[PDB]
Amino acid sequence: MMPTPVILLKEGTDSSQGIPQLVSNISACQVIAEAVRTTLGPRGMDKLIVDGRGKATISNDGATILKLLDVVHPAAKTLVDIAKSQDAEVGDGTTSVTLLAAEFLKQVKPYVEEGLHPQIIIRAFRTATQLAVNKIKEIAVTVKKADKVEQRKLLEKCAMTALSSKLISQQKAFFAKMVVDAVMMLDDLLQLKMIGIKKVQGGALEDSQLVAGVAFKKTFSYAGFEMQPKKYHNPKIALLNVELELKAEKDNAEIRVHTVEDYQAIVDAEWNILYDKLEKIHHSGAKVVLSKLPIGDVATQYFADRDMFCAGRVPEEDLKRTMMACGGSIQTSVNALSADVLGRCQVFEETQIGGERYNFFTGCPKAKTCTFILRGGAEQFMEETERSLHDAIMIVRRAIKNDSVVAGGGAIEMELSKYLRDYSRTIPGKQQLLIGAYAKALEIIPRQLCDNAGFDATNILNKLRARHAQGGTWYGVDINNEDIADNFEAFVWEPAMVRINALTAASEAACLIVSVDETIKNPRSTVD
Amino acid sequence: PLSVFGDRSTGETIRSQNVMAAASIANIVKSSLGPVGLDKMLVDDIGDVTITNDGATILKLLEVEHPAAKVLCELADLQDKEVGDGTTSVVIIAAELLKNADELVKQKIHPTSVISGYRLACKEAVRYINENLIVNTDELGRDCLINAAKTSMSSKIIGINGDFFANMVVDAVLAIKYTDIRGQPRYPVNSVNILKAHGRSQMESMLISGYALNCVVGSQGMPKRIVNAKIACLDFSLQKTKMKLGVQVVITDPEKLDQIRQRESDITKERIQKILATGANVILTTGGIDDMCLKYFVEAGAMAVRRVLKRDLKRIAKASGATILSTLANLEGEETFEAAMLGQAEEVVQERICDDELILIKNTKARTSASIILRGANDFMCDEMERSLHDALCVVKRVLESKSVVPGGGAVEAALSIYLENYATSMGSREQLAIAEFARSLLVIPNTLAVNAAQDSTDLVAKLRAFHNEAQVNPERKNLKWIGLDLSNGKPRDNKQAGVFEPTIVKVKSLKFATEAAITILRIDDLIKLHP
Amino acid sequence: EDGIPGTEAMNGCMICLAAEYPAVKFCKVKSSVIGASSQFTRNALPALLIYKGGELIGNFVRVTDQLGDDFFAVDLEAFLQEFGLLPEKEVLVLTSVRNSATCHSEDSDLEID
Amino acid sequence: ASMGTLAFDEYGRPFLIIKDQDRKSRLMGLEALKSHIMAAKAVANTMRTSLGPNGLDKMMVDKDGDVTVTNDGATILSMMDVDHQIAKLMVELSKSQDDEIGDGTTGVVVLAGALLEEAEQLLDRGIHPIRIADGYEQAARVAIEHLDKISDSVL
Amino acid sequence: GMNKMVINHLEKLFVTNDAATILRELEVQHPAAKMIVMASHMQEQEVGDGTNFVLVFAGALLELAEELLRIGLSVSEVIEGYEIACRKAHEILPNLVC
Amino acid sequence: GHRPVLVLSQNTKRESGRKVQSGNINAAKTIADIIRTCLGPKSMMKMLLDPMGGIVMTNDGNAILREIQVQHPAAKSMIEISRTQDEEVGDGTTSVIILAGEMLSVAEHFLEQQMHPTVVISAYRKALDDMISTLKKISIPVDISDSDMMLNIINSSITTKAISRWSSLACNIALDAVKMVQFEENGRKEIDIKKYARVEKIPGGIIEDSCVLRGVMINKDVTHPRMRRYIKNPRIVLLDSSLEYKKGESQTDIEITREEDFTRILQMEEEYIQQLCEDIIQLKPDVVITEKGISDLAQHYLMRANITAIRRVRKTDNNRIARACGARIVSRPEELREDDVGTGAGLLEIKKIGDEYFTFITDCKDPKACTILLRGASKEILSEVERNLQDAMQVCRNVLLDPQLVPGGGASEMAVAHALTEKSKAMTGVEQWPYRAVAQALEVIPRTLIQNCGASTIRLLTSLRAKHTQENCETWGVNGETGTLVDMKELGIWEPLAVKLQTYKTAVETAVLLLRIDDIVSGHKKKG
Numbered sequence A: 001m002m003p004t005p006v007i008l009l010k011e012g013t014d015s016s017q018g019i020p021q022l023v024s025n026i027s028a029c030q031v032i033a034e035a036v037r038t039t040l041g042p043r044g045m046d047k048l049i050v051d052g053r054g055k056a057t058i059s060n061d062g063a064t065i066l067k068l069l070d071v072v073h074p075a076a077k078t079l080v081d082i083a084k085s086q087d088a089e090v091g092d093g094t095t096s097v098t099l100l101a102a103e104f105l106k107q108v109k110p111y112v113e114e115g116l117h118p119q120i121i122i123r124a125f126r127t128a129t130q131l132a133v134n135k136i137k138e139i140a141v142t143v144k145k146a147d148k149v150e151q152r153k154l155l156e157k158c159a160m161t162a163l164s165s166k167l168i169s170q171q172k173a174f175f176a177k178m179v180v181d182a183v184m185m186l187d188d189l190l191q192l193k194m195i196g197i198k199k200v201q202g203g204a205l206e207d208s209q210l211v212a213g214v215a216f217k218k219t220f221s222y223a224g225f226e227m228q229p230k231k232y233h234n235p236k237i238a239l240l241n242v243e244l245e246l247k248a249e250k251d252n253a254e255i256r257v258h259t260v261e262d263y264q265a266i267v268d269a270e271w272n273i274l275y276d277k278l279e280k281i282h283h284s285g286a287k288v289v290l291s292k293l294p295i296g297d298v299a300t301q302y303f304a305d306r307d308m309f310c311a312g313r314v315p316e317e318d319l320k321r322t323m324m325a326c327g328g329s330i331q332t333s334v335n336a337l338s339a340d341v342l343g344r345c346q347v348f349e350e351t352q353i354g355g356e357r358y359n360f361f362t363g364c365p366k367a368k369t370c371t372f373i374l375r376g377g378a379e380q381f382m383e384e385t386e387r388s389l390h391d392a393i394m395i396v397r398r399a400i401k402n403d404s405v406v407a408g409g410g411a412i413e414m415e416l417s418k419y420l421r422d423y424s425r426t427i428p429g430k431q432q433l434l435i436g437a438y439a440k441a442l443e444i445i446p447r448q449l450c451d452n453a454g455f456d457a458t459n460i461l462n463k464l465r466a467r468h469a470q471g472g473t474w475y476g477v478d479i480n481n482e483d484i485a486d487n488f489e490a491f492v493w494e495p496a497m498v499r500i501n502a503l504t505a506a507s508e509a510a511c512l513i514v515s516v517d518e519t520i521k522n523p524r525s526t527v528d
Numbered sequence B: 001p002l003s004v005f006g007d008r009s010t011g012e013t014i015r016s017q018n019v020m021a022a023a024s025i026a027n028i029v030k031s032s033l034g035p036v037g038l039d040k041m042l043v044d045d046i047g048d049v050t051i052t053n054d055g056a057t058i059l060k061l062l063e064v065e066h067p068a069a070k071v072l073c074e075l076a077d078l079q080d081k082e083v084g085d086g087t088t089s090v091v092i093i094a095a096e097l098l099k100n101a102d103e104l105v106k107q108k109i110h111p112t113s114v115i116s117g118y119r120l121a122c123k124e125a126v127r128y129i130n131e132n133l134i135v136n137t138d139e140l141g142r143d144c145l146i147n148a149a150k151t152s153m154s155s156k157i158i159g160i161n162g163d164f165f166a167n168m169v170v171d172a173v174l175a176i177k178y179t180d181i182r183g184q185p186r187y188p189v190n191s192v193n194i195l196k197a198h199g200r201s202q203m204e205s206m207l208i209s210g211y212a213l214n215c216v217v218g219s220q221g222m223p224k225r226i227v228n229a230k231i232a233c234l235d236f237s238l239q240k241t242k243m244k245l246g247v248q249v250v251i252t253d254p255e256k257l258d259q260i261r262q263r264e265s266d267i268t269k270e271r272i273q274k275i276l277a278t279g280a281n282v283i284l285t286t287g288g289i290d291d292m293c294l295k296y297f298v299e300a301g302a303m304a305v306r307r308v309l310k311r312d313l314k315r316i317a318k319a320s321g322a323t324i325l326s327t328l329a330n331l332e333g334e335e336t337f338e339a340a341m342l343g344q345a346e347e348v349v350q351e352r353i354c355d356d357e358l359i360l361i362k363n364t365k366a367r368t369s370a371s372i373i374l375r376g377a378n379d380f381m382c383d384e385m386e387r388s389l390h391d392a393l394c395v396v397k398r399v400l401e402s403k404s405v406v407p408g409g410g411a412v413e414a415a416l417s418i419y420l421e422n423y424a425t426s427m428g429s430r431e432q433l434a435i436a437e438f439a440r441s442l443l444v445i446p447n448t449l450a451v452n453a454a455q456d457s458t459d460l461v462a463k464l465r466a467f468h469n470e471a472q473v474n475p476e477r478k479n480l481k482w483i484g485l486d487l488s489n490g491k492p493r494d495n496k497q498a499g500v501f502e503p504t505i506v507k508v509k510s511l512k513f514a515t516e517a518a519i520t521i522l523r524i525d526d527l528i529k530l531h532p
Numbered sequence C: 001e002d003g004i005p006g007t008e009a010m011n012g013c014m015i016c017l018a019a020e021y022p023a024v025k026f027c028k029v030k031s032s033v034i035g036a037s038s039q040f041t042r043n044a045l046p047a048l049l050i051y052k053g054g055e056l057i058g059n060f061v062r063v064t065d066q067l068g069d070d071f072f073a074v075d076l077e078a079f080l081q082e083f084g085l086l087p088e089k090e091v092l093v094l095t096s097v098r099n100s101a102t103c104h105s106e107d108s109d110l111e112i113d
Numbered sequence D: 001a002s003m004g005t006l007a008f009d010e011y012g013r014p015f016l017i018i019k020d021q022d023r024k025s026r027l028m029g030l031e032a033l034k035s036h037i038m039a040a041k042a043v044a045n046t047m048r049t050s051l052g053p054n055g056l057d058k059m060m061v062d063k064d065g066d067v068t069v070t071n072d073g074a075t076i077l078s079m080m081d082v083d084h085q086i087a088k089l090m091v092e093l094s095k096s097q098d099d100e101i102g103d104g105t106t107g108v109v110v111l112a113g114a115l116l117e118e119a120e121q122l123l124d125r126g127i128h129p130i131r132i133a134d135g136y137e138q139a140a141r142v143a144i145e146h147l148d149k150i151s152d153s154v155l
Numbered sequence E: 001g002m003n004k005m006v007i008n009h010l011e012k013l014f015v016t017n018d019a020a021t022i023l024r025e026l027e028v029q030h031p032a033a034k035m036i037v038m039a040s041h042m043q044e045q046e047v048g049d050g051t052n053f054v055l056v057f058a059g060a061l062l063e064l065a066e067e068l069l070r071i072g073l074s075v076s077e078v079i080e081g082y083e084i085a086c087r088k089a090h091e092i093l094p095n096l097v098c
Numbered sequence F: 001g002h003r004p005v006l007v008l009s010q011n012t013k014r015e016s017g018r019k020v021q022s023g024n025i026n027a028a029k030t031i032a033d034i035i036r037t038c039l040g041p042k043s044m045m046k047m048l049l050d051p052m053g054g055i056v057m058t059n060d061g062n063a064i065l066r067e068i069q070v071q072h073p074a075a076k077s078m079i080e081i082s083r084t085q086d087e088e089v090g091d092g093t094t095s096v097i098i099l100a101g102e103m104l105s106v107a108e109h110f111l112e113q114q115m116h117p118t119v120v121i122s123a124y125r126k127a128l129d130d131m132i133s134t135l136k137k138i139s140i141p142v143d144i145s146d147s148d149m150m151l152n153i154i155n156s157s158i159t160t161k162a163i164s165r166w167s168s169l170a171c172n173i174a175l176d177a178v179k180m181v182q183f184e185e186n187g188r189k190e191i192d193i194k195k196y197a198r199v200e201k202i203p204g205g206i207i208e209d210s211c212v213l214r215g216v217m218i219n220k221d222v223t224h225p226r227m228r229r230y231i232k233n234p235r236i237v238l239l240d241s242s243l244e245y246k247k248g249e250s251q252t253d254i255e256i257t258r259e260e261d262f263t264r265i266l267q268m269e270e271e272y273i274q275q276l277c278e279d280i281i282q283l284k285p286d287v288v289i290t291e292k293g294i295s296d297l298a299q300h301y302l303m304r305a306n307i308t309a310i311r312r313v314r315k316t317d318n319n320r321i322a323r324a325c326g327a328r329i330v331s332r333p334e335e336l337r338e339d340d341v342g343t344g345a346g347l348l349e350i351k352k353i354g355d356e357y358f359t360f361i362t363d364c365k366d367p368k369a370c371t372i373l374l375r376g377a378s379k380e381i382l383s384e385v386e387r388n389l390q391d392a393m394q395v396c397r398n399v400l401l402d403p404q405l406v407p408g409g410g411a412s413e414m415a416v417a418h419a420l421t422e423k424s425k426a427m428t429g430v431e432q433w434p435y436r437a438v439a440q441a442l443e444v445i446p447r448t449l450i451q452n453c454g455a456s457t458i459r460l461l462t463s464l465r466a467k468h469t470q471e472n473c474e475t476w477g478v479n480g481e482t483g484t485l486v487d488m489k490e491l492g493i494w495e496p497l498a499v500k501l502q503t504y505k506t507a508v509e510t511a512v513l514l515l516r517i518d519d520i521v522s523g524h525k526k527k528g
């Protein structure tokens, strides 16, 4: 290197190129995978990460852990990106994607060190990924019966499998039944915002309930609210977006009078406007009034005098869920409060839930929405419960789209590894080594399951390989018995799209990491 | 809870840290392996420049902090001390062994099983090398030594001039041959004095049929050339006599002072007179000579050299048949010098070498000696020449002492990999994996050789492995054990016919040392770093 | 420190002395690096500090007062000699060929027997 | 056993993965679980003196110097200025017990500390913490059923 | 060709093998290299492809111009020869259409 | 404090790859470009400012390069090459640097492609052997007994230096000095310009008064004014031992008890001095020269015999006087012999030059040492004149030892380049390209001569190449003063074969040495 009086790039520009930089990239990906390695399987663990402000997040979800890490390595960020992509598209398997991508890179690292051209590795990865995806689609088990009982069993089994790695795994059957019940009530779009999730401190996990309707927390009641009845046996619900209180008619409105009679008339006119709105609401027959806008004390006392329930400043999502549960319409004007725009529910009640009051709308027969009320001992407990339930809900939605399943516990990946090895045995030999490395890297998940569970991974992997070679597609890892078993008959079921997307994303990330030969870092600007 | 003033790393963290340190040390020198390797140029903090290809020199000059890296550096130094060649190969092999062993350990394979498998693999590799891959040099003649020197000097600054330097090295080694007790010939290398002087090209380096002294005559009045030299070697200074600490001169009668002062130099005058009267022409001493004694030698017409190095004086005395004298005292209590203490040489000349002069003692009798004067473009190139020349001398000495050689170019590594991969299936269940990993790690040498030449390492190593597998399986294809790598053309080649040889001791010692270092590093699973 | 008169003359003198006295370990360091007091930097900056065995044997400060600004290597050599701190000059070969060997083991030609 | 990992690459090039990775600590494996058990045990042993009719009070001072003398476990844990995350978990456990029931906010912390203390010696014998949690859940189910069995109804 | 991870001054990561994008994200400071980057960006704007061709051709032309200057030619002669050869190339190119 | 885990030291810097090779090659090119313009009869001088305050005004390559401090180790290697060339043959210092730079440039051309450096090195070594063969083929012999041809050779050596204006005087001085310092003893011939043939520069006077003395001149004066300052045919005695009473080696304390012992001791000191002086006088000399002090009493006793004494003479000066006047230095005066007396010096005279006394012994018959008395404008002018005279004497010694002669003015470069180009046509390998490139790299010398002369480089070089393609044009070069082609057997510019051989060998081996490096490690402690 020479000083070069006038330099090409500005000072501080760091450049790394060649084999060493790609080996460094592979090592960084290995570090990122190790950061979430232990959180896989029914014997997985949780990680606690404290941010700068001091708040801690406790999670078993791989995507959450990777997001919470402030990863700045350009090559290591690809694993976080593919974890986010897997979470977005599928919702489950965010640890397997990172493990598989890092294992691919680790397996091809020795060939990188010896000078193999990266294009050959990328082509081999693409070929192996295409073959594996086709094999998954071919061998995935589906039932062409459309039986309600069988579909319910399949959804429940998939939900339990998705849930049997979290802190709520002890109540996995109960929570899976709740999740399948909740998802099956969504109509056709399976919108996540139609499944409310409320976390209330206190109570056991088994105390959590699914409301066949809508439930939301009390919203800053005014004076005279306690004088209102708190239970109705067939209420008509007025869903409104209206501010019911005395206020200026308009922000730019100005009143000019030159007579005390006109002054009194104006005051009485304001009162009459408010009372006309209240009377229009009351005459509609509704007994419960909900508003997206504040409801004043005057309106609250007016409704109390009429034995009616009022609740202002209700969040918009809660109003939408109430509309979907009851069957009304959110009205910005009370001038036409016909029976078609009033919601109906069998029972409305305000009850106590762990030092917090909640409004309950139950008995809805045509409801297209739900509301989980999660109980726990701490904020992070309920947050992780919500994350696990979200994973289960996404899995159940995907299975609703298509009921194609493959046995879990590494059985599908052992079958894929055997198939890929058999294919690689019949090709020239430059691609054979790389496809064999791909097949070997496919064995990371069962090995990681055995390592997390505390077994001897080598013997279990040998038994699995021998079983798959001699026949038997769905033999995986039996965690409880420290052995191998037919995971399809053990109901360790996963949607095929989970593994398909996992393989696709891991292969794409590995190819992108391999394809890079030079990293250039410009000096930071505005460090402040 | 421990309350220890220091840092503690345990388990996978420290294992990966040790493997990273060893791999970094290996990767430092991996670019300097094989005939297509290239030298490195190191700069000190004071601006001193060293250009070298030797692994031991690089690892010694480097300042290293990690204990495992220090272990690897000391391994390179030990390999240099006990063999003299294969310093880069042993480090690379040890690091690869450690990396593969750690990869096995990460798979819940116990480190003790890996160590046992490594020991078994090393023992079987040594046995297989000794029983199948060795070539006796008796049927090869002098050409075997030339080929070994050529192979050693490849990748060095003197590689292209190997046709000349190999002959020089072989002649120098053969000139110092002697047989000790039990009738076993011995080749005391490091008895060949190597002088470095910038100037003319490499091809004009001289091999002296005698000894070369980095010294000049004491006085300009002495002759610079003596034909029939009678060398007298002394281990004492020739200066004005001074009494010891326990002796004091006290004068009471003034008339004695002049006699005292006269005798004070007459003693040395008489000693020099005896030494010259025995007939000596050349006088070499480890001590100093002052002006008066220099003038005595000048008047005598004799050559006198002062401050001669002790090792140089011993070599000259034994080559010429002289005896080192630390005093002119006999068993009769007198002061005598005998002609039987004089060495002889056919000529002693002070010749000029690039605006500087050195003394050549040509054709010493009763013993043949050898010295080499290396000519180069500058000091750094001469230093690299000296290092490469020492490597070649050590290789030739090993070949001559133990008359077995092995093919080079990675043939031994490929054969061992195939054989150990076959053999692992007959031992244990997890030491099987350890032996397989040992065999796989042995392939790092041909892989690095091929990589350094920008050749297709994968395809060449696959072809080499196929050739050696055919040699081991087929019974009449035993001639394929010599198939190595031809880095010039990037093709497999019968290295035994091509003349690419190595001493068996290099491979055996490298394997043993690398295995021991890998076992030592693998033995660690916890590090406590006490705060200073 | 940079810019103060007498520093470059001292550097030249040290270069010459190191040429003539290989044993001595002439070195220089900025006052900022050693963290000297601002008063010392402003008033007593050009100073020659002599050490021997970890203890001070030379305490020369403001050497320009007794050396000037045009002092040569001869002036510094004499000035150090007259306090008897500079080791005595040893005659040595100006330049020659190099050997670079130091004993070791088995470095012994031996008579055949 | 902290600071995470540091290798700086096997080629000498910089190796930076996580922002401010040299200023971030990390505990892993059984050591982190031991530290958590130690912190929870300390909190539980502090609280266990305020149990029963003969239990004693804690005099608590906030950052403004105001003095609160109380026996309520939830109040003590809420006003206690902790930094350890497991201590915050115990505080939240007391708060949740106070929210759901309103009494017994001290028994929950002592019980959790005792459970973790037993889990420590269970872990020392080589049992997966998930197995310990599963056994604890099974025993909790048994105890809850027994409590239902031995209960009495009041008017 | 191989992709390059380029992080600009705003910590934004670019993974691409497009020459124009790489030059845009790089903070080139030398005025002559800035001029060559301007030529590459102009080629990108006019056609949409061939930026790497522009860059490598300009580099080769300038290297050989340095060689010609070293062997004894003047700047004017080199420029005139380059212009003549460019006109010859633009004349030849229509005949190369397949 | 904070402890970062490291393998190597913090201050250890490592770089490798194409960057290292390019940096080395550009460093060598920059070193060559520094002194590119100091070659040829029309070279321009440079002012070098010493770190010690001195000024060096020279166009010699070695001085310019040694006065420059550099950080890049390749530049240090190039400077070491310059010093080696200066020490070996004493000429061609500027040419070797330019040749090495050009060879490294043409090597970089190949290293930019996918050619390994070892192939380039092997081609370079083959080319070097062929250059040596061609140079030995095209050389011509010289008659050392012909004084005119030797003077012409020295002139062509010094036509490129500032002393070329006084060409005849400088050539005669150099030839006479080299001839008379030439010695033969014990069958071993020697020249030894370094020890004898001392150059003494006395600023002032005119340079036309500079001459080589038939003897030795020293800057000394008689020890006492009564000494004779002009002796016709002196007999000179040289000593090292002091002529004064000195302490013995052993501790020799006296113990005086009688009264007269003190005066007796002083009297015996005087008597010892008198005895030494009488021993000196017994040989009947005229001049006594001592490397050490002479006592005042010794001066008196020497005066009683009318003997001039000079003391405190340097050892080298005393050896030079011994060689000039044919004396032998004697340590103990009592061991003086007749053959140790220096007879042969035909005049000794102490004369005053400026404000200083100088001792002249300048009429010796057959002296083997000489003093070259240089008088000139100032100190720097005389230093440059001394450097030029050193170059001339080195060239004269090279011709005397090796009577081979080679055409100059770039003719030899073109002849060797053409021969190598013709030879390369019958190899048909991959090494032919580097072979031809390094063959044509020799043309940088005629090109540099043309550039310095100010002529057209391209046209003249093309014409010279075309001429050298003919059948007998090996002696056709360029006139460095007129910028025209000319036959060197007519111009008369010839150089020793030893200088050319050393230049080519050193340049090729410098290129080979710098082509073997791809990794640089710096900053580590010396560790010793």
Ligand SMILES: Nc1ncnc2c1ncn2[C@@H]1O[C@H](COP(=O)(O)OP(=O)(O)O)[C@@H](O)[C@H]1O
Pocket: A039, A040, A041, A042, A044, A062, A092, A093, A094, A095, A096, A161, A162, A163, A164, A165, A407, A408, A409, A410, A445, A449, A477, A478, A479, A492
């Ligand atoms: N009951 C079970 N037995 C064996 N393996 C299981 C079981 N339940 C889940 N697994 C396996 O655990 C792996 C990881 O699942 P999990 O940790 O829930 O989500 P993620 O895939 O995001 O890590 C899956 O590949 C699945 O095959």
Ligand SMILES: Nc1ncnc2c1ncn2[C@@H]1O[C@H](COP(=O)(O)OP(=O)(O)O)[C@@H](O)[C@H]1O
Pocket: B032, B033, B034, B035, B053, B054, B055, B084, B085, B086, B087, B088, B089, B090, B150, B151, B152, B154, B155, B407, B408, B409, B410, B445, B449, B485, B486, B487, B500, B502
């Ligand atoms: N002419 C050659 N052809 C092929 N291979 C060679 C040749 N010479 C040496 N080798 C191989 O190159 C390898 C590296 O040798 P080198 O690194 O120079 O020695 P060291 O390991 O002592 O530094 C040796 O194992 C040898 O087998």
Ligand SMILES: Nc1ncnc2c1ncn2[C@@H]1O[C@H](COP(=O)(O)OP(=O)(O)O)[C@@H](O)[C@H]1O
Pocket: F038, F039, F040, F041, F043, F060, F061, F091, F092, F093, F094, F095, F096, F156, F157, F159, F160, F408, F409, F410, F449, F478, F479, F480, F481, F493
């Ligand atoms: N009158 C001349 N005409 C042409 N070339 C000349 C003449 N005199 C000398 N030269 C050339 O100049 C070169 C000497 O240049 P010089 O300054 O001495 O450089 P260096 O010190 O490296 O020899 C020689 O190679 C010679 O061929």
Ligand SMILES: [Mg+2]
Pocket: A092, A093, A161, A162, A163, A165, A391
């Ligand atoms: Mg999951």
Ligand SMILES: [Mg+2]
Pocket: B085, B086, B087, B152, B391
């Ligand atoms: Mg070697």
Ligand SMILES: [Mg+2]
Pocket: D103, D104
């Ligand atoms: Mg209580």
Ligand SMILES: [Mg+2]
Pocket: E049, E050, E051
């Ligand atoms: Mg394009």
Ligand SMILES: [Mg+2]
Pocket: F091, F092, F157, F160, F391
């Ligand atoms: Mg010259």
